[PDB]
Swiss-Prot record:
Organism of this sequence: Homo sapiens (Human)
Protein's UniProt name: Leukocyte-associated immunoglobulin-like receptor 1
Gene: LAIR1
Domain topic, free-text comment: ITIM (immunoreceptor tyrosine-based inhibitor motif) motif is a cytoplasmic motif present in 2 copies in the intracellular part of LAIR1. When phosphorylated, ITIM motif can bind the SH2 domain of several SH2-containing phosphatases, leading to down-regulation of cell activation.
Maturation and modification: May be phosphorylated by LCK. N-glycosylated.
Function: Functions as an inhibitory receptor that plays a constitutive negative regulatory role on cytolytic function of natural killer (NK) cells, B-cells and T-cells. Activation by Tyr phosphorylation results in recruitment and activation of the phosphatases PTPN6 and PTPN11. It also reduces the increase of intracellular calcium evoked by B-cell receptor ligation. May also play its inhibitory role independently of SH2-containing phosphatases. Modulates cytokine production in CD4+ T-cells, down-regulating IL2 and IFNG production while inducing secretion of transforming growth factor beta.
Topology Extracellular: residue spans: 1-98
């Protein structure tokens, strides 16, 4: 019923060691919480700092300032739009490029 959210990586999914990456989670209007799921160590980041790009969309961002090899692995977005949590987004595979 709730649309599956989308995940994007900026500047991309292949990232030099020490560089930043920003994950953008997008979903329907009215999302209360976006959660970035970091599969490799089973951790996550939550944010209520949600805003809209348009009337039918909302989004949130998660930045890793300095990527390390430990940041490689699958990432997904999931959102809370009461009453329920959404399905998980398709995964994005973060890969580290030593150079």
């Amino acid at each position: 019923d709730l649309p599956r959210p989308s995940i994007s990586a900026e500047p991309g999914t292949v990232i030099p060691l020490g560089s930043h990456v920003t994950f953008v989670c997008r979903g329907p209007v009215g999302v209360q919480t976006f959660r970035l799921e970091r599969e490799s160590r089973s951790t996550y980041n939550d944010t209520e700092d949600v805003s809209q790009a348009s009337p039918s969309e909302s989004e949130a961002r998660f930045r890793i300032d300095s990527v390390s090899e430990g940041n490689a692995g699958p990432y997904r977005c999931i959102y809370y739009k009461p009453p329920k949590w959404s399905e998980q987004s398709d995964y994005l595979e973060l890969l580290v490029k030593e150079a």
